[PDB]
Design a protein around this nucleic acid. Structure first.
Lengths: 49, 48
DNA sequence: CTCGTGCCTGGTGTCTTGAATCC
RNA sequence: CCCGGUGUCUUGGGUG
DNA sequence: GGATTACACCCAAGACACCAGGCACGAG
């Protein structure tokens, strides 16, 4: 490489936010009894607002 | 109709009623007591 | 055999007084 | 012998 | 007196007290 590269150890920390805890998709699914609209929340197969 | 105030099941079989359902019961109970009270024992203050 | 006493359940239910600035 | 769905109201901490 | 404090997502932890009546158990 025409340029030299800053290189060395650094302490790195692994944070709790991982993609497979966030990814979500909904085709059809459960609805609320009251509004007959898609439910809220990843944990309930919900839809985006 | 029940669509507006649906029942929900807290835990399994147990089901509580919507706030409107409880409140309509209170209006309905209170309506019956006017029936009986207007006819007898109504010396103004009681009705008030 | 008959009375005294504690536990479960349902209908009912209310009150000793004790955060800030725009129109 | 098909079809087949389950929760409501608040509190606390985050993410951007 | 009222009116309001941008939008979206996820996690975990709590839900009704008091008195009258019957029924079951223990003692004389």
């Amino acid at each position: 490489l025409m340029a030299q590269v800053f290189f060395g150890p650094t302490y790195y920390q692994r944070l709790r936010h991982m993609v497979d805890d966030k990814i979500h998709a909904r085709a059809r699914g459960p609805v609320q009894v009251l509004t007959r609209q898609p439910v809220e929340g990843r944990s309930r197969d919900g839809g985006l607002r | 109709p029940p669509q507006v105030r649906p029942s929900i099941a807290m835990d399994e079989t147990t089901q509580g009623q919507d706030d409107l359902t409880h409140k309509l019961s209170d209006i309905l109970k209170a309506n019956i007591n006017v029936q009986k009270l207007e006819m007898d024992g109504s010396p103004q203050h009681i009705i008030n």
